[PDB]
Write a protein that binds this ligand. Structure first.
Ligand SMILES: OC[C@@H](O)[C@@H](O)[C@H](O)[C@@H](O)CO
Ligand SMILES: OC[C@@H](O)[C@@H](O)[C@H](O)[C@@H](O)CO
Ligand SMILES: OC[C@@H](O)[C@@H](O)[C@H](O)[C@@H](O)CO
Ligand SMILES: OC[C@@H](O)[C@@H](O)[C@H](O)[C@@H](O)CO
Ligand SMILES: [Co+2]
Ligand SMILES: [Co+2]
Ligand SMILES: [Co+2]
Ligand SMILES: [Co+2]
Ligand SMILES: [Co+2]
Ligand SMILES: [Co+2]
Ligand SMILES: [Co+2]
Ligand SMILES: [Co+2]
Lengths: 391, 390, 392, 392
């Protein structure tokens, strides 16, 4: 059973996806935001997220806009759901065909910023703490079409303005850049968790910026999602996370969390939950950015919403048991996993004492050490037996 | 090829005996003095090497000393320099779980000593860059390696190297070399971005950059030219390894331009049709490739020349591309240069932007969305330049 | 250069007609009028046009309308001299085909799918098409337990056997080309590569009537060597048609202009198709472009991209011929022993008994001396590329 | 659980015997004695051992040496009761094979390759092996112009026809299994996927004697669905043998323990093999592990890893069994209409004429209403994973 302390959130665009893919028409009718709010509260979610255009149809008058916001607000009210994050749609409308913030067309860039400032206003009114930015159209199909250097300057220029505004209006938002390697552009700028973290480090107020990595995004490049998250945590830039499934380098599948690379889903939950001193290593929302398969109807939709929560709770339970097992604890010792936490250098030791240590080189028996095994297969087999519920 | 082109090769490239994961070596060992002489002849301006490529692992000092002296004499006679040096922290069994990040504390200590030793030699030969390729840093299984602790230990080791270099006045720059996998299932710092992000966290970051390799980024299906552009933006492109690859599969290390030719073209354009008229990058054009296993030493020398030849041919077409009036017109129609103009007018902030009805309230997005960028046409002129069709 | 009708460049109506609605955004271009399409293509040099039933006649058109459209379309063909070399059927767009056409778990959908194809065969026969292309875009699954692959192959076969029967009985004279694709839109599509599709075809009742229609980008989506797969297809005599386009390895289907993805492989492919045995092309069917003008483009970009497909093919053709005609290349081919592979391993009349008696093939063979000689493959590759760059 | 001889788990001598010399480093383990390997495998529950000629008998051993080795080997087999179900030949290590064995551009290498194999068939037939596996690891190219594929397929076929001839004439009763691989060690390998190999086998003189030996990670190196290709191999009845291991998508060949790569695909694979044609195994040959103990391990890790392969197979078999015996899973299958795919699309005796006559198949078909019904695939996939997780 899911509790509000689990912090499961879903985007309105997930359960609301009508299943219009690149090769066919929608197979499901539109979902009413209010209904979405009641259904999600009912399956155990603690919050909902949305793109401006998901809640208010692009081009709605203020009267309409205002009315929609009012009803949405009531729904949250009655159900107790919160809005931990909001985002802006800078990919759908034809105007953004070459990007929002990095469109070659200057007028588009000015417009994309305005669209976002507005969404920032709504987010602050609803109490959202994080603004996620997915630059889906920032990038190119052809190398000569985009000056990457100029693009990074313009991406930077726009973000610095957004931080200025938030800080000045006192919104207290955190900004999370979401990396993606491709799709819809041939290549997207800031293709991985690594490129997004390096870019953020160059902004004016870098402490307000982090990343929102997505499981399938990193897997589209055949990268290890867990190892990437571990790196993000080391830098302290994991501001939010999108969970879903994918089967390697192919179109973005957005399957239910754990329905793609199951072994990596397990090590991920282990990383987020079996944090230092019992406690999770991560504290924000556990947000599912997935899509109910095109072959399903609304029954299938609610089922898939529950499957995400279910997968996460079953994995947590097995990650917990894994760590708690004295036999795993013995295998961990033999493989020396914790020995990596001991500094390489003795306290106060520098280059000169190290050069003076004959045991670190001149008298070191590399051949003898090179022959001892690490016992890694065995430790790995123990983990899978826990995942399989065989231990 | 001029010394000014700065083409360099690793001793281990032309010297690769072609022993692969599935077969025996098909070529005999290449003598280092010989390699220096042959590389000087093909137009290389410099040579690089791992410690163990030059001095066999475990050579006594007399031997080691002898080899260096001969090596230095060959350098002397041909006029070749040593722009970069590196350390083999991957071959010997002791490094099976990594050098700086091995779970075993004693291997970590030995790894640092092995590198300090190589720094002294590099300093001695005049090398300016120390490249570090952490090929054994990573894992096959997620529960076997604590990534957070591994980054601490990677960081602890690099801080010490810089300390030493700086106290001794060596003036070295450090370039981390990213690779997603092979030999490990997953290697730490898998892409150029992960490596740049990491370097920003060291104690003397100004001393650290990256050494991206064409093929390593392509093993993940990333755009090499686009990652180099970001590296240049951060000013962390300290060195570059050029070669060819055909997408995600084992590391092929083909001659530069024999893998993704279109990306090879846009890369030379980026590196050479720099800022002014000038190159955007001024370091060595280093070829980290392998002569195919099917070749003998005639093939080896041919493959070395092919690297230089691909670069010069692409350079020539990149220049011609940029000088074409038809290309200038296509660039003008695709608004490439408009991206260089700030989004905001000088002195404009969020308050002035919010006051501009034309940036939103009266913005005709429908009308803007209907005009084409003409990117296909621009792409077509680039390719025609590549094929010498214009 | 200039395209002639003998080059046989053809384009799908859905190619230049793609409005650019992708998985993440709305259409950026208005609808293309088919008569206009016929006219525009004639002008850029195409010798034929192809289409899906639903590209020409809107799904759910009354008989009157349908007839109306066809007759206008036939006039334009008439007027311009374009032919219809191939026709295909859309079994992927309408929601009813969400689990497939021919292999839908739902039996009623399979029956409907067959009927929809029968109808296109008739229109096809009437327009003079020689090939029926079948792209089973929704045949596959997202989850392994959801599709019995064996049963699906039975049903796939069952539907194809019937179409062959019909065509033969009506005297249509069609050939059928199955088009493989590894994924998108299904997580996994059945008959994922050219290989799997050829193996399948061999199991049909009148296999001589079935071949494949491989697409450059589909094979590359799995990182396979397109040229090598087409060489195998030709070896089997199953290349009934070909879809040309570009792709940048394993990622979503990009459908770029031919030669705008893997340029080196586009070169070797043109070389294989044209620098066939007896000087002549190894393949004589349509050179069909199944690509999409980028979403960033307007109608000018659209006609520009259509012409680019042709320009790319012709520029590569020209370099492939220069390559083969170069004496230095001839010398490199000889040192690489490329043609020695065409001489049989055994001397005429030799069998295992005579091979076993040859001490020189084993007992006295010096593997070590043979293993030391290089094949000169790098030099040969370098010469190919210099020809491609127009540097020679 | 415990492995029985009835489980038919086999290992190649080269698996537990891999010294861990990779492309970037020296071996981390000392050589394993073949007799010791027989004893150790017998002890963990294997029923058979397989080997390449060069794994048992060092390349170039004189006849007395070779004979002594074989004799000691046979004694160990005798004493442990292990059998030799398949043998193979190394046509990839020696420098002479740098451009392939059967398809080297060099004619003399092709003659030597055939003799190396014939000699191995003799030893196999004497040890009682029933299958000869052929992995053409060096057949291919790094550059397109270096290899004529058509000529290569002719030479490949030429060699294989001779081998069938010899076997049939000697009464060896061997079956031949070609093992596909997309790349590594060559940039591109001929017959890259199970599909390509099946299509090729179909062109031999005696196709009934030929099938495939597909490997889990080889198909995953192309990001293909292994279970789905296995399903197709079974449909063609060409699954002669199988190599089980683990891989993480497109990268170098990892050869991890079976189930340590794509766990979900491993699960549906065991479901297909054991519960295939309903309840009964769809495959009865060896369950062969072609894996490598990680380079980080010592001999204790090697035996642990050999045991992990068997454990993984048995755990998944148990979960696959429970999955199918679950009345809720059955109900989901019914709802998803999985079995309805097994019912012919056409009625008994119905032809195109009758089909064309059925208005319910088209004229009166409500596509729109059918298109709106959900298949319930997500729910079915969730039950499958809950079985795998032991949560049900
Ligand atoms: O591939 C789509 C991407 O994952 C998207 O769903 C974002 O997360 C959203 O635009 C911001 O939350
Ligand atoms: O994949 C091998 C790697 O690219 C290596 O050759 C490095 O470049 C070298 O160890 C540092 O220069
Ligand atoms: O990926 C889509 C596929 O390539 C399609 O365009 C087909 O070729 C058509 O359905 C049959 O011609
Ligand atoms: O990748 C190596 C290949 O998988 C090999 O192990 C073959 O199976 C063997 O040579 C035939 O048995
Ligand atoms: Co996504
Ligand atoms: Co997301
Ligand atoms: Co490399
Ligand atoms: Co390198
Ligand atoms: Co396509
Ligand atoms: Co196509
Ligand atoms: Co293998
Ligand atoms: Co194998």
């Amino acid at each position: 059973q899911a509790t509000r302390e689990d912090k499961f959130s879903f985007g309105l665009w997930t359960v609301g996806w009508q299943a219009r893919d690149a090769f066919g028409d929608a197979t499901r009718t539109a979902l009413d935001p209010v209904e979405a709010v009641h259904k999600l509260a009912e399956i155990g979610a603690y919050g909902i997220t949305f793109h401006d255009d998901d809640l208010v149809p692009f081009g709605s008058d203020a009267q309409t806009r205002d009315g929609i916001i009012a009803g949405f607000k009531k729904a949250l009210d009655e159900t107790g759901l919160i809005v931990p994050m909001v985002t802006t749609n800078l990919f759908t409308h034809p105007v953004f065909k070459d990007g929002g913030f990095t469109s070659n067309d200057r007028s588009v860039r000015r417009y994309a910023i305005r669209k976002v400032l507005r969404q920032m206003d709504l987010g602050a009114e609803l109490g959202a703490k994080t603004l996620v930015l997915w630059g889906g159209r920032e990038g190119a199909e052809y190398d000569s079409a985009k000056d990457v250097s100029a693009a990074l300057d313009r991406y930077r220029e726009a973000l610095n303005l957004l931080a200025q505004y938030s800080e000045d209006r006192g919104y207290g938002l955190r900004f999370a850049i979401e990396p993606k390697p491709n799709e819809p552009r041939g290549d997207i700028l800031l293709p991985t968790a690594g490129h997004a973290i390096a870019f953020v480090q160059e902004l004016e107020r870098p402490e307000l910026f982090g990343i929102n990595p997505e499981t399938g995004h990193e897997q589209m490049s055949n990268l290890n999602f867990t190892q990437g998250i571990a790196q993000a945590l080391w830098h302290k830039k994991l501001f939010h996370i999108d969970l879903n499934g994918q089967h390697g380098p192919k179109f973005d599948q957005d399957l239910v969390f754990g329905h793609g690379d199951l072994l990596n889903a397990f090590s991920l939950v282990d990383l987020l939950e079996n944090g230092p001193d019992g406690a999770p290593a991560y504290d924000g929302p556990r947000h599912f950015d997935y899509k109910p398969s095109r072959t399903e109807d609304y029954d299938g939709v609610w089922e898939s919403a529950r499957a995400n929560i279910r997968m996460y709770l079953l994995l947590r339970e097995r990650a917990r048991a894994f760590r708690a097992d004295p036999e795993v604890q013995e295998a961990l010792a033999a493989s020396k996993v914790a020995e990596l936490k001991t500094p390489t250098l003795n306290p106060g030791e520098g280059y000169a004492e190290l050069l003076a240590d004959r045991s670190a080189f001149e008298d070191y028996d590399a051949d003898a050490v090179g022959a001892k095994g690490f016992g890694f297969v065995k430790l790995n087999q123990l983990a899978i037996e826990h995942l399989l519920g065989a231990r």
